[PDB]
Scaffold this active site. Sequence first.
Site, mmCIF file in Angstrom:
data_model
loop_
_atom_site.group_PDB
_atom_site.id
_atom_site.type_symbol
_atom_site.label_atom_id
_atom_site.label_comp_id
_atom_site.label_asym_id
_atom_site.label_seq_id
_atom_site.Cartn_x
_atom_site.Cartn_y
_atom_site.Cartn_z
ATOM 1 N N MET A 55 0.419 -0.733 -0.199
ATOM 2 C CA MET A 55 -0.483 -0.036 -0.166
ATOM 3 C C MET A 55 1.013 1.122 -0.035
ATOM 4 O O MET A 55 0.768 2.277 -0.738
ATOM 5 C CB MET A 55 -0.742 -0.248 0.773
ATOM 6 C CG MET A 55 -1.648 0.904 1.360
ATOM 7 S SD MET A 55 -0.806 2.826 2.174
ATOM 8 C CE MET A 55 -0.891 2.063 2.860
ATOM 9 N N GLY A 56 1.712 1.393 1.279
ATOM 10 C CA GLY A 56 2.910 2.319 0.265
ATOM 11 C C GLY A 56 3.387 2.841 -0.578
ATOM 12 O O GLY A 56 3.452 3.856 -1.550
ATOM 13 N N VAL A 58 2.022 2.020 -3.593
ATOM 14 C CA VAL A 58 0.691 2.561 -4.400
ATOM 15 C C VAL A 58 0.478 4.218 -4.095
ATOM 16 O O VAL A 58 0.596 5.179 -4.133
ATOM 17 C CB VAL A 58 -0.844 2.171 -4.214
ATOM 18 C CG1 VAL A 58 -0.710 1.576 -3.222
ATOM 19 C CG2 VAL A 58 -2.019 2.162 -4.944
ATOM 20 N N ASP A 59 0.670 4.283 -2.666
ATOM 21 C CA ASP A 59 0.686 6.049 -1.678
ATOM 22 C C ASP A 59 1.496 6.168 -2.333
ATOM 23 O O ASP A 59 1.242 7.830 -2.076
ATOM 24 C CB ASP A 59 0.823 5.299 -0.775
ATOM 25 C CG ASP A 59 -1.145 5.924 0.178
ATOM 26 O OD1 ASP A 59 -1.729 6.568 -0.555
ATOM 27 O OD2 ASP A 59 -1.034 5.501 1.056
ATOM 28 N N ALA A 60 2.441 6.012 -3.000
ATOM 29 C CA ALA A 60 3.777 6.822 -3.196
ATOM 30 C C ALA A 60 4.046 8.410 -3.654
ATOM 31 O O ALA A 60 3.718 9.536 -2.866
ATOM 32 C CB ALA A 60 5.097 6.667 -4.291
#
Lengths: 77, 77, 57
Positions: A55-56, A58-60
């Site tokens: 998820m990190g 994708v969150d970048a």
Amino acid sequence: NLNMDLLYMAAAVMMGLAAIGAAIGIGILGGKFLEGAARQPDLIPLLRTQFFIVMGLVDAIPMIAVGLGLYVMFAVA
Amino acid sequence: NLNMDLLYMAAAVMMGLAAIGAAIGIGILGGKFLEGAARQPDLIPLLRTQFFIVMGLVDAIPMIAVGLGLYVMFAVA
Amino acid sequence: KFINTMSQVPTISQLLPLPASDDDDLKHKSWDYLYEPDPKALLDTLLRRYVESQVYQ
């Protein structure tokens, strides 16, 4: 003067796009996490670990986009 | 002056895009949640737990965007 | 039915519809299968093969 009103509009477009991206990406990811969970719950903690990992990734970008949205909106005003 | 012309459009862009993102993401995730429930009840509480865990992350950026939309539309203009 | 070397007994027993064992797979709550292609086509062949196996036994 004329500058500020367009600086707000540009922050609006930037943050709205960042929002669509983050939301739909994390939804697509969480869907697969949940359907993996439903078939074998005992693996829930391992799957949750993998999910909070990816998820990190994708969150970048979206968080960069919203950071610069705030910068434009307030620091440059 | 022109600020109260343009800034309403800015807010509208921001909030419309946030709405698209949040609604679609939650739709996808809740859909996988439901098809998980029907496949195996007696897990409904556990899958509902995990569903909320994930849903918390989906709404983040959309909610920031909605907050800033309200701010501009009421605080500034 | 071959029971003991000196004793054998005739039995009529049912194999359709499937008689219900007391085995509890409530402990199997912990998982479910991946079905390739789908569970409905698999249950059919499982039941047919099971009937054939019981007749062979």
